[PDB]
Design a protein around this nucleic acid. Structure first.
Ligand code: MG
Ligand code: MG
Ligand code: MG
Ligand code: MG
Ligand code: MG
Ligand code: MG
Length: 210
DNA sequence: CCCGGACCTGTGACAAATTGCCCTCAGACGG
DNA sequence: GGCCGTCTGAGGGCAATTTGTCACAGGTCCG
């Protein structure tokens, strides 16, 4: 199945995208890499890749596409818009898109890799972000261990403000996304909290492959 | 000493958003 | 040649779940 590769700078960028937008973003990076920034998406293929009907595929593409407007990406810092022209459809079932050509060197560079089947059943976009960050440290055999700082997670993944309260961070982000990864990917993941005084400061992730 | 106060945790409620489903009808194509 | 039946997808919706927010119960240590 398709092997996604991406620069760590994208793995670690600050941005806010939905699941459907992130799904589309994987094919663009795939299209770009197999070679101006102009990409294309076919409704009937998207539906087959992600096990959707044509109707619901059309809905996902149309709404993802119109929600890119105004979205910006920050590399730590430097900000860019993802698109420099609205999307548009020349043919029935076909969409054409214009990625900011200045984003090319950030996609292709110190890199992150995974096959697309690893991520296509994850639902929560923050769990997609976390799984991409763990892959960045994965070893050939399939295991790894990394300590991520809580403030950096909140900035990079652009978590909403109520997750600055640690019990809400635990309940609605960490536990849920560790549970998805363990149920929906081939990775088996555990973690432990690092503290300093009363504040919890980092999360230490260990994982191996099934 | 005990207190009020500034920290921390977890849970019950409720509001806002997202999920996979369902139904309609015209476009593109070929037999 | 040209009409029509089928495969698509572009629309309009839905209720059941999940995600985002905040009040209050309950712990510690400080001055
Ligand atoms: Mg979202
Ligand atoms: Mg959808
Ligand atoms: Mg403190
Ligand atoms: Mg008393
Ligand atoms: Mg009680
Ligand atoms: Mg008290």
């Amino acid at each position: 199945s398709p092997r996604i590769v991406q620069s760590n700078d994208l793995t670690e960028a600050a941005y806010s995208l939905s699941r459907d937008q992130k799904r589309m973003l994987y094919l663009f990076v795939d299209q770009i890499r197999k070679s101006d920034g102009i990409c294309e998406i076919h409704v009937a293929k998207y539906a087959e890749i992600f096990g959707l009907t044509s109707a619901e595929a059309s809905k996902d593409i149309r709404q993802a596409l119109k929600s890119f407007a105004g979205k910006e990406v920050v590399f730590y810092y430097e900000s860019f818009p993802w698109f420099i022209k609205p999307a548009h459809s020349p043919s029935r079932g076909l969409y054409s898109v214009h990625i900011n050509p200045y984003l090319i060197p950030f996609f292709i560079g110190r890199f992150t890799q995974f096959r697309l089947s690893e991520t296509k059943e994850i639902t929560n976009p923050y769990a997609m972000r976390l799984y991409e960050s763990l892959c960045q440290y994965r070893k050939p055999d399939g295991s790894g261990i990394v300590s991520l700082k809580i403030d950096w997670i909140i900035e990079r993944y652009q978590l909403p403000q109520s997750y600055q309260r640690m019990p809400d961070f635990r309940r609605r982000f960490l536990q849920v996304c560790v549970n998805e990864i363990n149920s929906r990917t081939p990775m088996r993941l555990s973690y432990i909290e690092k503290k300093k005084g009363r504040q919890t400061t980092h999360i230490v992730f260990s994982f191996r492959d099934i």
